[PDB]
Design a protein around this ligand. Structure first.
Ligand SMILES: Nc1ncnc2c1ncn2[C@@H]1O[C@H](COP(=O)(O)OP(=O)(O)O)[C@@H](O)[C@H]1O
Ligand SMILES: Nc1ncnc2c1ncn2[C@@H]1O[C@H](COP(=O)(O)OP(=O)(O)O)[C@@H](O)[C@H]1O
Ligand SMILES: [Zn+2]
Length: 625
């Protein structure tokens, strides 16, 4: 049987009708902004969940005509995460309750450890502890099958690359990738069948060493009797699909269409319609830089012992492209984000950030500035958008104020701000939607019926520049606007860097709160790229390929080489081999995650790492060099 999506029009989807096989591993592919999430999350998941919830007591619809063959749907992404600070790995996985029943059926301690002490072992240690239990002959008969269930659920955590976590770990201290995979392990452990699962890039944060095991886990989720829809860019996940849906042909206005549908073999046989197929067949490639850079100096952080780091000294060559690599849990974010970054902020720029344990830093005088480019949002209210954040909107407002019609009406540039009274729609605060005054719980946000969502009063909307009013400009994608304003240098420059980091599909007025973490990071990256005379700035970026198709990664790599070419240093934490194979220098941590990680397993060029038999990263690098 099949899901039949009829007349899908959410965002840039071109009123498409798509048939999707059920009880299959379906991989949705395509460049950023092509419409993968619009189809899989905003249409299929949303409607499947909505139709189930409408069966409840006492009880929104996406822009779509109908969906045949729908089932209740469950999403696994970075938004389906716990916000309860009380929650731990043990509680969000539902393993803690099983442990409670186990301890109530045996005693306060089991083989020397109480329950809290059990939860403080890593997952692999917990598994070995339980499997080395045969303390009794009849307690077996009261907990036996129960232990099996506990073991089953722990094994699923190992299977999604999280063996280094403890059950006692606070859920809010997990990364987005860790949270996604925790939820995957919990959903497969639940054994629920008959649902449509929609997963957003479940390889985020996962080393290639673990990809195959993740793929087996996705197939087990399928084999329970579920449809498993995965939005993914990873080549191996794509090659393991039962069915591929490739969205394109491009992003933004140039996207919203299914350009290929069928098996992997069919995609390889006829790839010239899809970028995805061209990369998969080798017709298109992210190039390996064949001139590795040498550093002009280095800095060195000594005695790092934060978390599992094994009292390591780490040298950062400056003026080159640096990747920090290694399996998940090996210590990369502990080293880079939680020790080196705050320690250099404190030395160079206004201290007082807490930093992981370490002895000293030498050579920090060899850089002038330390800037993190992370995935935290660019703003917290829809009053922020890409145009205001990069501050090109101030230039667009001046331009509108300079039209003959605006000057004759007395409209200065403030008239064209939706954050100031005057030109903005005062009913909807200059946002386009109003709430219902209940008393406080998440109310409905209905579209403003005065302005119809356009954010400005009708008088302000009468001013046009080349037939477009200010609302029209906010509805342009970056690429549209980049063509529209190509004769205005200050505007074109900002729009150009947004296009160069791969955000040509993003609308100028998209509210900050709807942007993914990767999109926020790339906007901030474009802001840094736009600046002149940065010189000896060290930039740190954590996993900047989240959300990125092959072509998007090609763009990201070009941008990073541009930053380094103008004298900067770049450190990225990555698992992506197309980025790593472009590094001038790699610091590979591990060998494993947790207690058996935290060592420096290898350093040097991609070629040197590839030659190192102790490096998992080098083992996969070998095949792309
Ligand atoms: N919440 C939103 N509001 C308005 N436009 C959006 C929103 N989310 C995505 N878009 C736009 O819709 C188009 C498709 O986006 P999306 O479905 O997220 O692409 P993908 O998942 O393929 O990266 C893009 O031009 C994007 O900028
Ligand atoms: N609150 C915490 N935040 C981050 N890591 C933690 C925390 N508590 C313990 N750790 C551990 O530190 C070790 C290294 O983790 P991390 O630096 O996150 O690895 P990576 O970034 O390579 O995936 C892991 O064993 C991880 O479980
Ligand atoms: Zn309004």
């Amino acid at each position: 049987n099949e899901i039949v999506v009829k007349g899908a029009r959410v965002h840039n989807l071109k009123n498409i009708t798509v048939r999707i096989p059920k009880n299959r591993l379906v991989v949705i592919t395509g460049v950023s902004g092509s419409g993968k999430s619009s189809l899989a999350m905003d249409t299929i998941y949303a409607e499947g969940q909505r139709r189930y919830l409408e069966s409840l007591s006492t009880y929104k619809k996406p822009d779509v005509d109908e969906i045949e063959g729908l089932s209740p749907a469950i999403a696994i992404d970075q938004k389906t995460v716990s916000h309860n600070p009380r929650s731990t790995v043990g509680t969000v996985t539902e393993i803690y309750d099983y442990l409670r029943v186990l301890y109530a059926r045996i005693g306060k301690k089991i083989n020397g450890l109480n329950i809290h002490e059990f939860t403080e072992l890593s997952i692999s240690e917990e598994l070995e502890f339980l499997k080395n239990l045969n303390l009794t002959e009849r307690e077996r008969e009261i907990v036996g099958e129960l232990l099996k269930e506990i073991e089953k659920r722990l094994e699923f955590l190992v299977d999604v690359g999280l063996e280094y976590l403890t059950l006692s770990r606070s859920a809010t201290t997990l990364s987005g990738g860790e949270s996604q995979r925790i939820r995957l392990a919990t959903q497969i452990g639940s054994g629920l069948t008959g649902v449509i699962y929609v997963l957003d890039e479940p390889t985020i944060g996962l080393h290639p060493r673990d990809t195959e095991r993740l793929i087996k886990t996705l197939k087990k989720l399928r084999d329970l009797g579920n449809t498993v829809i995965v939005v993914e860019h990873d080549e191996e996940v794509i090659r393991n699909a039962d069915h591929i849906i490739d969205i394109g042909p491009g992003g933004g206005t140039n996207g919203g269409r299914v350009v290929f549908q069928g098996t992997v073999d069919e995609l390889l046989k006829n790839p010239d319609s899809s970028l995805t197929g061209e990369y998969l067949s080798g017709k298109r490639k992210i190039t390996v830089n064949k001139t590795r850079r040498l550093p002009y100096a280095s800095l060195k952080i000594k005695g790092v012992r934060h978390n599992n780091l094994k009292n390591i000294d780490v040298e950062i060559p400056l003026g080159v492209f640096v990747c920090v690599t290694g399996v998940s849990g090996s210590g990369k974010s502990s080293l880079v984000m939680e020790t080196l970054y705050p320690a250099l902020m404190n030395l160079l720029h206004k201290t007082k950030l807490p930093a992981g344990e370490f002895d000293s830093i030498e050579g920090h005088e060899n850089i002038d500035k330390m800037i993190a480019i992370d995935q935290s949002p660019i703003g917290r209210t829809p009053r922020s958008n890409p145009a205001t954040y990069t501050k090109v909107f101030d230039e667009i407002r001046s331009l509108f104020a300079m039209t003959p019609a605006a000057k004759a009406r007395g409209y200065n540039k403030s008239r064209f701000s939706f954050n100031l009274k005057g030109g903005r729609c005062e009913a909807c605060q200059g946002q386009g939607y109003v709430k219902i005054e209940m008393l406080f719980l998440p109310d409905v946000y209905v579209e403003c019926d005065v302005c119809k969502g356009k954010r400005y009063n009708r008088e302000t909307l009468e001013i046009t520049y080349k037939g477009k009013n200010i609302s029209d400009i906010l509805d342009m994608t970056v690429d549209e606007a980049l063509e529209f304003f190509k004769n205005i240098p200050s505007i074109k420059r900002t729009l150009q860097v947004l296009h160069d980091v791969g955000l040509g599909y993003v609308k100028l007025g998209q509210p900050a709160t709807t942007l993914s973490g990767g999109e926020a990071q790339r906007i901030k990256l474009a802001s840094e790229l736009r600046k002149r005379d940065t010189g000896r700035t060290l930039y740190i970026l954590d996993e900047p390929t989240v959300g990125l198709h092959f072509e998007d990664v090609r763009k990201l790599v070009e941008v990073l080489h541009r930053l380094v070419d103008r004298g900067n240093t770049v450190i990225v934490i990555e698992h992506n081999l197309d980025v790593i194979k472009n590094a001038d220098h790699i610091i590979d941590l591990g060998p494993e995650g947790g207690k058996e990680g935290g060592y420096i397993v290898a350093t040097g060029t991609p070629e040197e790492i590839a030659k190192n038999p102790h490096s998992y990263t080098g083992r996969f690098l070998k095949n792309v060099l």
